[PDB]
């Protein structure tokens, strides 16, 4: 990384600037740089990492779908060539993030908040790879996403209240995984329902701001359940 000569604090400040400028490729590069300094990440810094890469891969996923859709509707080689190019670049970004999680973010994450957050990311990024994967390689990718999500669920169930936004976001995305990737719509539905219900029973314990955070994600759960049922 060319970010080796820049201060950690400066990389973090530049990542915040890049967010404001909607320069997500720069933001990702800055946060990569920050991770590679080797220090654990705070809560705020974990979120900067997440936002940067989610924006970068989201653009690639959207581009991939447009092209893949054109490719299908045309049942010359340019559409396939270009879809493969986008696909390769998406895979590169997924592998970068997973490389960061594996070297040494996850293993240095002692707290439940940090470990579930990174394990959730691991699931998400294997899920994105699974979206573009074909055949048996796909089966292993899928299993890696599930195993990462599952470990995160087990920790969040032991260590976090049911209203915890990270636990809720995890359950939301794991449910999406079941529905869209694993061909288990019933598992998807059960998880979303159960998560929603246990959070609702615990809303009484929250402050006004925590309540707002939890209910925001609870609504996203309900919207999926409505779509799925």
């Amino acid at each position: 990384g060319a970010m080796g000569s820049m201060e950690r604090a400066s990389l973090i400040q530049k990542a915040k600037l890049a967010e404001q400028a909607e320069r997500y490729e720069d933001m990702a590069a800055f946060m990569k740089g920050a991770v590679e300094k080797g220090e654990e990440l705070s809560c705020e810094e974990r979120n900067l990492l997440s936002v940067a890469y989610k924006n970068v891969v989201g653009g690639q996923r959207a581009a991939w779908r447009v092209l893949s859709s054109i490719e299908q509707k045309s049942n010359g080689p340019e559409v396939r060539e270009y879809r493969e190019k986008v696909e390769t670049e998406l895979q590169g970004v997924c592998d970068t993030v997973l490389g960061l999680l594996d070297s040494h973010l996850i293993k240095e994450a002692g707290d439940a908040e940090s470990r579930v957050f990174y394990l959730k990311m691991k699931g998400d990024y294997y899920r994105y790879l699974a979206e573009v994967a074909t055949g048996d390689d796909k089966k292993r990718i899928i299993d890696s996403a599930r195993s990462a999500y599952q470990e995160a669920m087990d920790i969040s169930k032991k260590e976090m209240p049911p209203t915890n936004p990270i636990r809720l976001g995890l359950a939301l995305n794991f449910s999406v995984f079941h529905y869209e990737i694993a061909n288990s719509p019933e598992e998807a539905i059960s998880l979303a329902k159960t998560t929603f219900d246990e959070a609702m029973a615990d809303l009484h314990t929250l402050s006004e701001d925590s309540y707002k955070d939890s209910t925001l994600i609870m609504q996203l759960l309900r919207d999926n359940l409505t779509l799925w049922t």
Binding site: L172, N173, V176, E180, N224, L227, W228
Partner: peptide, 8 residues
């Protein structure tokens, strides 16, 4: 394609 957690 169903919405996952958005990025705010």
């Amino acid at each position: 394609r169903t919405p996952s957690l958005p990025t705010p």
